[PDB]
Design a protein around this nucleic acid. Structure first.
Ligand SMILES: O=c1[nH]c(=O)n([C@H]2C[C@H](O)[C@@H](COP(=O)(O)OP(=O)(O)OP(=O)(O)O)O2)cc1F
Ligand SMILES: [Ca+2]
Ligand SMILES: [Ca+2]
Ligand SMILES: [Cl-]
Ligand SMILES: [Cl-]
Ligand SMILES: [Cl-]
Ligand SMILES: [Cl-]
Ligand code: NA
Ligand code: NA
Length: 326
DNA sequence: CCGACAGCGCATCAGC
DNA sequence: GCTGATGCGC
DNA sequence: GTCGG
C-alpha cells in the first residue's frame, strides 16, 4: 500500500467511467494504471515519475500531481457530490445491476437501497438475489473459511463421482488471505474436447451441493457455468455465516491447464497475458492457446501439458499463482 | 496520429 | 421456436 | 486514457 492513495483514486475513476460514463476503455485504462502503480516498489513522489510507467500517460500524471499536492481530486470531489452519478454508482454494486440497468432505475426515481426493496417486483432473478444478499456479498471471505468451503466442495464432489476433480482457483489459488468469492474449476473424464460421454455433469454436482444445503441460490446455470450462492454451516446457537458467491466452471478435462490459468487470474493478469500473447502471435482463452496465421485467424490448438507450456509459448518466464495478483 | 484495447457463458430481448 | 445483439458477470 | 508503429 505504498501508493494506496493513488491507486484508490484511479480505481474510483475507473468505476466512474464504467458505471456512469459507460466508457469501458477508460475504465480499463484507469485499472491498468492502478495495477502498474500498485506493483511499483517505491513511494511515488511526482506525476512525472509516474508517467514513466507504461499505461500512465499525461492525463493520469496530472491527476497524480493534483492528488499529491492536495490529498484529493476535484474531479472526484465533484463526482461524489453529484446525486445521480453517486446513485448510479451505488446501484451497480448490486449483482445483476450493471451501468444500463442502474441508469434506467435512477431515471425512474429508484435511487436507494430502500427504493430497490420497495420495487423488488421490477428486478430480474439475478438482481433479486443480488439485492437479497447485498450486505453479505459486500463482505470478504477469510482464507480459513475458504479452506472449510473447499473441504465441503471437494468432499461432496467425490461422493457424486470419485473421478471428478474440483480445483479452487481465483484469489484463493493465488494465496490471498481473504477472497471476494469462491471459484471452483471442475473436470470429469467423460467431458473432453472430443466428446461429452455423460449428461448433466455440472447439474449433478450443483444438485448434490444443494441437497446438503451448501448451495442456497442460483444466479445463472448452464451446461458448463454455474453462478450462485453458498453458506458454511454454523453450530448450535452460533450466528449464521454470511452467504457467499460461488462460481463453478466445468472445463474439458484435456483443457485443464488453460482452464486453471484462466480461473486463477487475476483478471488484469489474464488481460496482460492475453494481450502479450496477441503481440507474440497467439490467442489464449480458457480452453486453448492457438497460433494466429498471416491473416490473424486462429489456427489449431497447440499441445499443452502444463501451465508453464502456455508461458513458454509466448516467451514469458513462469510466474507462480501467488505472483499473478495484478 | 489512430487503431486496438482478452475472451467468453448465461439471461434476456427484438425480430423473424 | 431460433438467431443475433445486448447486458452482465467472471 | 494510453500508446506502438
Ligand atoms: O474480467 C474478468 N476476467 C477474468 O479472466 N477473470 C478470471 C480471473 C479471476 O481470478 C477469475 C475469478 O474471478 P473473480 O472475480 O472471482 O476474481 P478474484 O481474482 O478471484 O478475486 P476476489 O478475491 O474474488 O475478488 O476469473 C475474472 C474477471 F472478472
Ligand atoms: Ca474469486
Ligand atoms: Ca468469482
Ligand atoms: Cl471508452
Ligand atoms: Cl478525492
Ligand atoms: Cl490445456
Ligand atoms: Cl478454443
Ligand atoms: Na507511461
Ligand atoms: Na452490479
Amino acid at each position: 500500500t505504498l501508493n494506496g492513495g493513488i491507486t484508490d483514486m484511479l480505481t474510483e475513476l475507473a468505476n466512474f467511467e464504467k458505471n456512469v460514463s459507460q466508457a469501458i476503455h477508460k475504465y480499463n485504462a484507469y485499472r491498468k494504471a492502478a495495477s502498474v502503480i500498485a506493483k511499483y516498489p517505491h513511494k511515488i513522489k511526482s506525476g512525472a515519475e509516474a508517467k514513466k510507467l507504461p499505461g500512465v500517460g499525461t492525463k493520469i500524471a496530472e491527476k497524480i500531481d493534483e492528488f499529491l499536492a492536495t490529498g484529493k481530486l476535484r474531479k472526484l470531489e465533484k463526482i461524489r457530490q453529484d446525486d445521480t452519478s453517486s446513485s448510479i454508482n451505488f446501484l451497480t454494486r448490486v449483482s445483476g445491476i450493471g451501468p444500463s440497468a442502474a441508469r434506467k432505475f435512477v431515471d425512474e426515481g429508484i435511487k436507494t437501497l430502500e427504493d430497490l426493496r420497495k420495487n423488488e417486483d421490477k428486478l430480474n432473478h439475478h438482481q433479486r438475489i443480488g439485492l437479497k444478499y447485498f450486505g453479505d456479498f459486500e463482505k470478504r471471505i477469510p482464507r480459513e473459511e475458504m479452506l472449510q468451503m473447499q473441504d465441503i466442495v471437494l468432499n461432496e464432489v467425490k461422493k457424486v463421482d470419485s473421478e471428478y476433480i474440483a480445483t479452487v482457483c481465483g484469489s484463493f489459488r493465488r494465496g490471498a488471505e481473504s477472497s471476494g468469492d469462491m471459484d471452483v474449476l471442475l473436470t470429469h473424464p467423460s467431458f473432453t474436447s472430443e466428446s461429452t460421454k455423460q449428461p448433466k455433469l455440472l447439474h449433478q454436482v450443483v444438485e448434490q451441493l444443494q441437497k446438503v444445503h451448501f448451495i442456497t441460490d442460483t444466479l445463472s446455470k448452464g451446461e458448463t457455468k454455474f453462478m450462485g450462492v453458498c453458506q458454511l454451516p454454523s453450530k448450535n446457537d452460533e450466528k449464521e455465516y454470511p452467504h457467499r458467491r460461488i462460481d463453478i466452471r466445468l472445463i474439458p478435462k484435456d483443457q485443464y491447464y488453460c482452464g486453471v490459468l484462466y480461473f486463477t487470474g487475476s483478471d488484469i493478469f489474464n488481460k496482460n497475458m492475453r494481450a502479450h500473447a496477441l503481440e507474440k502471435g497467439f490467442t489464449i482463452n480458457e480452453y486453448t492457446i492457438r497460433p494466429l496465421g498471416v491473416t490473424g485467424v486462429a489456427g489449431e490448438p497447440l499441445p499443452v501439458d502444463s501451465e508453464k507450456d502456455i508461458f513458454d509459448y509466448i516467451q514469458w518466464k513462469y510466474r507462480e499463482p501467488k505472483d499473478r495478483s495484478e
